[PDB]
Amino acid sequence: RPTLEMVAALAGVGRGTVSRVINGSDQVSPATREAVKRAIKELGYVPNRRTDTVALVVSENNQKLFAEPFYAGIVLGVGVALSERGFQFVLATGRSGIEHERLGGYLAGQHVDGVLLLSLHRDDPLPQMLDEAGVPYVYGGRPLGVPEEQVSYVDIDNIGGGRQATQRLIETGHRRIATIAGPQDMVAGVERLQGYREALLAAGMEYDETLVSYGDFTYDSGVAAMRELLDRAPDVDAVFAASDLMGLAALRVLRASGRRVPEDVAVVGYDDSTVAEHAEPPMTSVNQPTELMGREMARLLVDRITGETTEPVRLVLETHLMVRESG
């Protein structure tokens, strides 16, 4: 079956160019686009084409699975929902280009009935690799830069969650409200920042990028971000951290700097995890229904595998705020 690699080889370009032609990106010259399309035609290439087994792919290094509380709940829900339907799963990981290469090549070999895609980053190649092999998949987290109507996914209302977190800080009287945002190559990072922005504007407050710092959902990134916020805006009085681990980092940086939480700076996190429960002070945090998300991911994928559902399905789940001492 013709591959993207074969198209690139014949056209004399690389994977990045062919991937851009497949997606209809503007980032290709007309002459090179036409060369790629000629190769596609010559090869008969089509980009967008039992084992009782699903691959749950987490597009991160495996240590993220154990460090960040989100993953455990997804895996719990996936496991239960697949068990109820007679399916099992295997868990696959990897952040790097070579890991994506090897995993995409493997999943093109008819070793699983379908794939669940979790924690993907913008421009990760695995969806393309699965589409050209005809392997069905469902996302956990809407894909950035893909038209929504073409894909099936379960996601959280992270714009709403970001609004809930920021509205809490507005409602308790704060006027210099910062965020440690998630990474902007991940849908939840984009949308929790969007919710923060929408809350500020709905309240008649300014969106000041001085008060926006970015992490990558790790603790260490939260440490660096909180330190930077204090340098830029020593008068910050509240922080919305877009994950509990980044919020835990913020609490520790705030305390090290001599600021009381919540009296000087209030903090709200996201995940409503044991990280928040056991923080000092216990951390207010947005609760998202991670187990249900996993269950629904598995349900939607099995329906595609069995033919019960033949059109894309998208499901968005609501959040709520869990109030503790920190904000």
Ligand X SMILES: OC[C@H]1O[C@@H](O[C@H]2[C@H](O)[C@@H](O)[C@H](O)O[C@@H]2CO)[C@H](O)[C@@H](O)[C@@H]1O
Binding mask 183-212 for ligand X (x = CB under 6 A): -----x------------------------
- 240 lies in the site for ligand X, by CB under 6 A: no
- 79 lies in the site for a second copy, by CB under 8 A: yes
Task: Give the integer Cα–Cα distance in Å for 108 and 5.
Answer: 13
- 238 lies in the site for a second copy, by CB under 8 A: no
Angle CA 191–197–198, to nearest 5 = 90
- 219 lies in the site for ligand X, by CB under 6 A: no
* Residue 271 binds which of a second copy, ligand X, none (CB < 5-8 A, kind-dependent): ligand X
Report which residue type is found at 173: G
Task: Give the integer Cα–Cα distance in Å for 247 and 168.
Answer: 15
- 164 lies in the site for ligand X, by CB under 6 A: no
- 126 lies in the site for a second copy, by CB under 8 A: no
CA 307 to each of CA 47, 89, 261, 270, 313: distance values in angstroms, whole numbers, following the listed order: 21, 19, 53, 36, 13
Nearer to a second copy, 93 or 158 (CB): 93
Binding mask 96-125 for a second copy (x = CB under 8 A): ---x--xx--x--x-x--------------
Report which residue type is found at 268: V
H helix runs in 209-315, sequence order: 219-232, 244-256, 274-277, 290-306
Residue 53 C-beta: closest distance to a second copy, Å: 6
Take residue 102 and report the two structure tokens written for it: 């090897």
Task: Using CB under 6 A, list all residues that contact ligand X.
Answer: 68, 70, 118-119, 140-141, 155-156, 158, 188, 217, 243, 270-271, 288
